[PDB]
CSV table of C-alpha atoms in Angstrom, one decimal:
chain,number,residue,atom,x,y,z
H,1018,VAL,CA,0.0,0.0,0.0
H,1019,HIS,CA,1.5,3.3,-1.2
H,1020,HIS,CA,-0.7,6.3,-1.4
H,1021,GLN,CA,0.7,9.6,-2.8
H,1022,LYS,CA,-0.8,12.8,-4.2
H,1023,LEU,CA,-4.4,11.5,-4.4
H,1024,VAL,CA,-5.9,14.9,-5.2
H,1025,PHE,CA,-3.6,17.2,-7.2
H,1026,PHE,CA,-4.1,20.9,-8.0
H,1027,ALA,CA,-1.3,22.1,-10.3
H,1028,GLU,CA,-2.6,25.6,-10.7
H,1029,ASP,CA,-4.5,28.2,-8.6
H,1030,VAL,CA,-7.9,27.4,-7.1
H,1031,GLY,CA,-10.4,30.2,-6.8
H,1032,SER,CA,-12.7,29.0,-3.9
H,1033,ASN,CA,-13.8,25.9,-2.2
H,1034,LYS,CA,-17.5,25.9,-1.1
H,1035,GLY,CA,-17.8,22.1,-1.2
H,1036,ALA,CA,-15.7,19.2,0.0
H,1037,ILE,CA,-12.1,18.2,-1.0
H,1038,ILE,CA,-11.2,14.8,0.4
H,1039,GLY,CA,-8.0,13.0,-0.4
H,1040,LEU,CA,-9.1,9.6,0.9
H,1041,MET,CA,-12.4,8.7,2.4
H,1042,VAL,CA,-13.0,5.3,4.1
H,1043,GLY,CA,-16.7,4.7,4.1
H,1044,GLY,CA,-18.8,7.4,5.6
H,1045,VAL,CA,-21.2,9.9,4.0
H,1046,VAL,CA,-20.3,12.9,1.9
H,1047,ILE,CA,-23.1,15.4,1.3
H,1048,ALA,CA,-22.5,18.4,-1.0
V,93,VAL,CA,-0.9,-1.6,-4.7
V,94,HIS,CA,0.4,1.8,-5.9
V,95,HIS,CA,-2.0,4.8,-6.0
V,96,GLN,CA,-0.7,8.1,-7.4
V,97,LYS,CA,-2.4,11.3,-8.7
V,98,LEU,CA,-5.9,9.8,-8.7
V,99,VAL,CA,-7.6,13.2,-9.4
V,100,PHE,CA,-5.4,15.6,-11.4
V,101,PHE,CA,-6.1,19.3,-12.2
V,102,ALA,CA,-3.4,20.6,-14.5
V,103,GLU,CA,-4.9,24.1,-14.8
V,104,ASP,CA,-6.8,26.5,-12.6
V,105,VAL,CA,-10.2,25.6,-11.0
V,106,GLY,CA,-12.8,28.3,-10.6
V,107,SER,CA,-14.9,27.0,-7.7
V,108,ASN,CA,-15.8,23.7,-6.0
V,109,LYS,CA,-19.4,23.6,-4.8
V,110,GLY,CA,-19.6,19.8,-5.0
V,111,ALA,CA,-17.3,16.9,-3.9
V,112,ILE,CA,-13.8,16.1,-5.0
V,113,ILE,CA,-12.7,12.8,-3.7
V,114,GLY,CA,-9.4,11.1,-4.7
V,115,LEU,CA,-10.3,7.6,-3.4
V,116,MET,CA,-13.6,6.6,-1.7
V,117,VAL,CA,-14.0,3.2,-0.2
V,118,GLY,CA,-17.7,2.3,0.0
V,119,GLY,CA,-19.8,4.9,1.6
V,120,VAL,CA,-22.4,7.4,0.1
V,121,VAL,CA,-21.6,10.5,-1.9
V,122,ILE,CA,-24.5,12.9,-2.4
V,123,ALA,CA,-24.2,15.9,-4.6
P,1302,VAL,CA,0.8,1.6,4.8
P,1303,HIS,CA,2.5,4.8,3.6
P,1304,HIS,CA,0.4,7.9,3.2
P,1305,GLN,CA,1.9,11.1,1.8
P,1306,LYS,CA,0.7,14.3,0.3
P,1307,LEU,CA,-3.0,13.1,0.1
P,1308,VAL,CA,-4.3,16.6,-0.9
P,1309,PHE,CA,-1.9,18.8,-2.9
P,1310,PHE,CA,-2.2,22.4,-3.8
P,1311,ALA,CA,0.7,23.4,-6.0
P,1312,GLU,CA,-0.4,27.1,-6.5
P,1313,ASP,CA,-2.3,29.7,-4.6
P,1314,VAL,CA,-5.8,29.1,-3.1
P,1315,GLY,CA,-8.2,32.0,-2.9
P,1316,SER,CA,-10.5,31.0,-0.1
P,1317,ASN,CA,-11.9,27.9,1.6
P,1318,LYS,CA,-15.5,28.1,2.7
P,1319,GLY,CA,-16.0,24.3,2.6
P,1320,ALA,CA,-14.0,21.4,3.9
P,1321,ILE,CA,-10.5,20.3,3.0
P,1322,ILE,CA,-9.8,16.9,4.6
P,1323,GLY,CA,-6.6,14.9,3.9
P,1324,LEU,CA,-7.9,11.6,5.2
P,1325,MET,CA,-11.3,10.9,6.7
P,1326,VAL,CA,-12.1,7.6,8.4
P,1327,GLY,CA,-15.8,7.1,8.3
P,1328,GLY,CA,-17.9,9.9,9.7
P,1329,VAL,CA,-20.1,12.5,8.0
P,1330,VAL,CA,-18.9,15.4,5.9
P,1331,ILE,CA,-21.6,18.0,5.1
P,1332,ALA,CA,-20.9,20.9,2.8
W,390,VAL,CA,1.5,3.3,9.6
W,391,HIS,CA,3.4,6.4,8.4
W,392,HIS,CA,1.4,9.6,7.9
W,393,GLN,CA,3.2,12.6,6.4
W,394,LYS,CA,2.0,15.9,4.8
W,395,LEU,CA,-1.6,14.8,4.5
W,396,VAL,CA,-2.8,18.3,3.4
W,397,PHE,CA,-0.2,20.3,1.5
W,398,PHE,CA,-0.4,24.0,0.4
W,399,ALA,CA,2.7,24.8,-1.7
W,400,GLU,CA,1.7,28.5,-2.3
W,401,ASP,CA,-0.1,31.2,-0.5
W,402,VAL,CA,-3.6,30.8,0.9
W,403,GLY,CA,-5.9,33.8,0.9
W,404,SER,CA,-8.4,33.0,3.7
W,405,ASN,CA,-9.9,30.0,5.5
W,406,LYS,CA,-13.6,30.4,6.4
W,407,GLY,CA,-14.2,26.6,6.4
W,408,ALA,CA,-12.4,23.6,7.9
W,409,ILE,CA,-8.9,22.3,7.1
W,410,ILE,CA,-8.4,19.0,8.7
W,411,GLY,CA,-5.3,16.8,8.1
W,412,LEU,CA,-6.7,13.6,9.6
W,413,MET,CA,-10.2,13.1,11.0
W,414,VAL,CA,-11.2,9.9,12.7
W,415,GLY,CA,-14.9,9.5,12.6
W,416,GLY,CA,-16.9,12.5,13.8
W,417,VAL,CA,-18.9,15.1,12.0
W,418,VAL,CA,-17.6,17.9,9.8
W,419,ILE,CA,-20.2,20.6,8.9
W,420,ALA,CA,-19.3,23.4,6.5
B,1221,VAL,CA,2.2,5.0,14.4
B,1222,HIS,CA,4.2,8.0,13.2
B,1223,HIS,CA,2.4,11.3,12.5
B,1224,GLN,CA,4.3,14.2,11.0
B,1225,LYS,CA,3.4,17.5,9.3
B,1226,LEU,CA,-0.3,16.6,8.9
B,1227,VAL,CA,-1.3,20.1,7.8
B,1228,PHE,CA,1.4,22.0,5.8
B,1229,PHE,CA,1.4,25.6,4.7
B,1230,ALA,CA,4.5,26.3,2.6
B,1231,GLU,CA,3.8,29.9,1.9
B,1232,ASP,CA,2.0,32.8,3.6
B,1233,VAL,CA,-1.6,32.6,4.9
B,1234,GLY,CA,-3.7,35.7,4.8
B,1235,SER,CA,-6.3,35.0,7.5
B,1236,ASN,CA,-8.0,32.1,9.3
B,1237,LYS,CA,-11.7,32.7,10.1
B,1238,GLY,CA,-12.5,28.9,10.2
B,1239,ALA,CA,-10.8,25.9,11.8
B,1240,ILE,CA,-7.4,24.4,11.1
B,1241,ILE,CA,-7.0,21.1,12.9
B,1242,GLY,CA,-4.0,18.8,12.4
B,1243,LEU,CA,-5.6,15.7,13.9
B,1244,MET,CA,-9.2,15.4,15.2
B,1245,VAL,CA,-10.3,12.2,17.0
B,1246,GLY,CA,-14.1,12.0,16.7
B,1247,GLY,CA,-15.9,15.1,17.9
B,1248,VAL,CA,-17.8,17.7,15.9
B,1249,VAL,CA,-16.3,20.5,13.7
B,1250,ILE,CA,-18.7,23.2,12.7
B,1251,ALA,CA,-17.6,26.0,10.3
X,1064,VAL,CA,-47.1,48.0,-11.7
X,1065,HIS,CA,-47.4,46.0,-8.5
X,1066,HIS,CA,-44.7,43.4,-7.7
X,1067,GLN,CA,-45.1,41.3,-4.6
X,1068,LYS,CA,-43.6,38.0,-3.3
X,1069,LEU,CA,-42.0,37.1,-6.7
X,1070,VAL,CA,-40.0,34.2,-5.2
X,1071,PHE,CA,-41.7,32.4,-2.3
X,1072,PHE,CA,-40.2,29.7,0.0
X,1073,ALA,CA,-42.9,28.5,2.3
X,1074,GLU,CA,-40.8,25.9,4.1
X,1075,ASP,CA,-37.1,25.4,5.0
X,1076,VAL,CA,-34.3,25.6,2.5
X,1077,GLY,CA,-31.3,23.5,3.0
X,1078,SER,CA,-28.6,25.3,1.0
X,1079,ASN,CA,-28.1,27.8,-1.8
X,1080,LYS,CA,-25.1,27.2,-4.0
X,1081,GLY,CA,-26.7,28.9,-7.1
X,1082,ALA,CA,-28.5,32.1,-7.7
X,1083,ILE,CA,-31.9,33.2,-6.2
X,1084,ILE,CA,-33.1,36.4,-7.9
X,1085,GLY,CA,-36.5,37.9,-7.4
X,1086,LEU,CA,-36.5,40.2,-10.4
X,1087,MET,CA,-33.7,40.5,-13.0
X,1088,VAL,CA,-33.8,43.2,-15.6
X,1089,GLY,CA,-31.7,42.1,-18.5
X,1090,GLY,CA,-28.2,41.0,-17.7
X,1091,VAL,CA,-26.6,37.6,-17.6
X,1092,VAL,CA,-27.1,34.8,-15.0
X,1093,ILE,CA,-24.6,32.0,-15.1
X,1094,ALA,CA,-25.0,29.0,-12.8
R,965,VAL,CA,-43.9,51.2,-9.3
R,966,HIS,CA,-44.3,49.3,-6.0
R,967,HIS,CA,-41.8,46.6,-5.1
R,968,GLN,CA,-42.3,44.6,-2.0
R,969,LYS,CA,-41.0,41.3,-0.6
R,970,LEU,CA,-39.4,40.2,-3.9
R,971,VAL,CA,-37.5,37.3,-2.3
R,972,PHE,CA,-39.4,35.6,0.6
R,973,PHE,CA,-38.1,32.9,3.0
R,974,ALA,CA,-41.0,31.9,5.3
R,975,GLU,CA,-39.0,29.2,7.2
R,976,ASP,CA,-35.4,28.7,8.2
R,977,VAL,CA,-32.5,28.7,5.7
R,978,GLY,CA,-29.5,26.4,6.4
R,979,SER,CA,-26.7,28.1,4.5
R,980,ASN,CA,-26.1,30.5,1.6
R,981,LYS,CA,-23.0,29.7,-0.5
R,982,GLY,CA,-24.4,31.4,-3.7
R,983,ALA,CA,-26.1,34.7,-4.4
R,984,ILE,CA,-29.5,35.9,-3.1
R,985,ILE,CA,-30.5,39.1,-4.9
R,986,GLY,CA,-33.9,40.8,-4.4
R,987,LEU,CA,-33.6,43.1,-7.5
R,988,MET,CA,-30.8,43.1,-10.0
R,989,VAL,CA,-30.7,45.8,-12.7
R,990,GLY,CA,-28.6,44.5,-15.6
R,991,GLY,CA,-25.1,43.3,-14.6
R,992,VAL,CA,-23.7,39.9,-14.3
R,993,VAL,CA,-24.4,37.2,-11.7
R,994,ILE,CA,-22.0,34.2,-11.7
R,995,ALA,CA,-22.6,31.3,-9.4
T,1182,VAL,CA,-40.6,54.3,-6.9
T,1183,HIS,CA,-41.2,52.6,-3.6
T,1184,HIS,CA,-38.9,49.8,-2.5
T,1185,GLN,CA,-39.6,47.8,0.7
T,1186,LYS,CA,-38.4,44.5,2.1
T,1187,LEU,CA,-36.7,43.3,-1.1
T,1188,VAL,CA,-35.1,40.3,0.6
T,1189,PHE,CA,-37.0,38.8,3.5
T,1190,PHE,CA,-36.0,36.1,6.0
T,1191,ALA,CA,-38.9,35.3,8.2
T,1192,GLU,CA,-37.1,32.6,10.3
T,1193,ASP,CA,-33.5,31.9,11.4
T,1194,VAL,CA,-30.6,31.7,9.0
T,1195,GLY,CA,-27.7,29.4,9.7
T,1196,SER,CA,-24.8,30.9,7.9
T,1197,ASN,CA,-24.0,33.2,5.0
T,1198,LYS,CA,-20.9,32.2,3.0
T,1199,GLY,CA,-22.2,33.8,-0.2
T,1200,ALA,CA,-23.7,37.2,-1.1
T,1201,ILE,CA,-27.0,38.6,0.1
T,1202,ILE,CA,-27.9,41.8,-1.8
T,1203,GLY,CA,-31.2,43.7,-1.5
T,1204,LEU,CA,-30.8,45.8,-4.6
T,1205,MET,CA,-27.9,45.7,-7.0
T,1206,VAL,CA,-27.6,48.3,-9.8
T,1207,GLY,CA,-25.4,46.9,-12.5
T,1208,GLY,CA,-22.1,45.6,-11.4
T,1209,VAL,CA,-20.8,42.0,-11.1
T,1210,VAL,CA,-21.7,39.5,-8.4
T,1211,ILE,CA,-19.4,36.4,-8.2
T,1212,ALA,CA,-20.2,33.5,-5.9
M,563,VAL,CA,-37.4,57.5,-4.3
M,564,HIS,CA,-38.1,55.8,-1.0
M,565,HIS,CA,-35.9,52.9,0.2
M,566,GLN,CA,-36.7,51.1,3.3
M,567,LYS,CA,-35.8,47.7,4.9
M,568,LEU,CA,-34.0,46.4,1.8
M,569,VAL,CA,-32.6,43.4,3.5
M,570,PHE,CA,-34.7,42.0,6.4
M,571,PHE,CA,-33.8,39.3,8.9
M,572,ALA,CA,-36.8,38.6,11.1
M,573,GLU,CA,-35.1,35.9,13.2
M,574,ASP,CA,-31.6,35.1,14.5
M,575,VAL,CA,-28.6,34.8,12.1
M,576,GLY,CA,-25.9,32.3,13.0
M,577,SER,CA,-22.9,33.7,11.2
M,578,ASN,CA,-21.9,35.9,8.3
M,579,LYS,CA,-18.8,34.8,6.4
M,580,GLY,CA,-19.9,36.4,3.1
M,581,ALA,CA,-21.3,39.8,2.2
M,582,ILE,CA,-24.6,41.4,3.3
M,583,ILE,CA,-25.3,44.6,1.3
M,584,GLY,CA,-28.5,46.6,1.5
M,585,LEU,CA,-27.9,48.6,-1.6
M,586,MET,CA,-24.9,48.4,-4.0
M,587,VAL,CA,-24.5,50.9,-6.8
M,588,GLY,CA,-22.3,49.4,-9.5
M,589,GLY,CA,-19.1,47.9,-8.2
M,590,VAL,CA,-17.9,44.4,-7.8
M,591,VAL,CA,-19.0,41.9,-5.1
M,592,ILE,CA,-16.8,38.7,-4.8
M,593,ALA,CA,-17.8,35.9,-2.5
O,1317,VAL,CA,-33.9,60.4,-2.0
O,1318,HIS,CA,-34.8,58.8,1.4
O,1319,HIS,CA,-32.8,55.9,2.7
O,1320,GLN,CA,-33.8,54.2,5.9
O,1321,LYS,CA,-33.0,50.8,7.6
O,1322,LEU,CA,-31.3,49.4,4.6
O,1323,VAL,CA,-30.0,46.3,6.4
O,1324,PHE,CA,-32.2,45.1,9.3
O,1325,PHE,CA,-31.5,42.5,11.9
O,1326,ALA,CA,-34.6,42.0,14.1
O,1327,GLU,CA,-33.1,39.3,16.3
O,1328,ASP,CA,-29.7,38.3,17.7
O,1329,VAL,CA,-26.7,37.8,15.4
O,1330,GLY,CA,-24.1,35.2,16.5
O,1331,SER,CA,-21.0,36.4,14.7
O,1332,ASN,CA,-19.8,38.5,11.7
O,1333,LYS,CA,-16.7,37.2,10.0
O,1334,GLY,CA,-17.6,38.8,6.6
O,1335,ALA,CA,-18.9,42.2,5.5
O,1336,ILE,CA,-22.1,44.0,6.5
O,1337,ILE,CA,-22.6,47.1,4.4
O,1338,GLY,CA,-25.7,49.2,4.4
O,1339,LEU,CA,-25.0,51.2,1.3
O,1340,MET,CA,-21.9,50.7,-1.0
O,1341,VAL,CA,-21.3,53.1,-3.9
O,1342,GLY,CA,-19.1,51.4,-6.4
O,1343,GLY,CA,-16.0,49.9,-5.1
O,1344,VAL,CA,-15.0,46.3,-4.5
O,1345,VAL,CA,-16.3,43.9,-1.8
O,1346,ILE,CA,-14.3,40.7,-1.3
O,1347,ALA,CA,-15.5,38.0,1.1
């Protein structure tokens, strides 16, 4: 098991009004 | 097992009002 | 198990009005 | 188990009006 | 178990009006 | 001319991630 | 000309991550 | 011309992470 | 011209992390 | 021209981490 750079943003991000999750194990994501 | 760069954004992202998940194991995603 | 750089932001981020989570184990994320 | 740099911000961040969590074990995140 | 640098800010941060948590065990985060 | 209650929400609204406009005169709405 | 109660919310509103405008004259709305 | 109560919130509002504008004359709204 | 109560909040407001403007003449609103 | 009570809060407000402006003439609002 070798996790690396799961979510990558190479350039600029304006705003985040939702959810940014690299690794979610089960659970509930509501957006 | 070798995970790398699962979600990639090479250029700029305006806004995120939803869900960005690199790796989701089971669970519920509602958008 | 080897976790590294799960959420990566290479350039500038304007604002965060949501949720940025590197690793979420179960649970509930509401955005 | 070896956690390192779970949430990474390479450049400047303007503001944080939400939640930035490196590692969340269960629980509830509301944004 | 070896936790290190869970939330990383390489450059300057303008303001924090939300929550920055390196490691949250259960509990509730409201933002 | 008698405008009244152009957009009505009788019960609870969960979230607004788009645009709610009562009266728009020309212009551009992007969602 | 008689404008009144252009946008009405009778019950509770959870969150507003977009734009709520009662009366917009021209212009650009981006959401 | 008689403007009154352009945006109305009868019950409680949880949070405002966007823009609430009663009357906007031209201009740009970005959310 | 008779402006009155352009933005109305009848009940309690939890938090304001955006912009609440009663009357905006031109200009730019970014949220 | 008769401006009165442009932004109204009838009940208690928890916190203000954004911008509350009664009347803005041009200019830039960033939140």
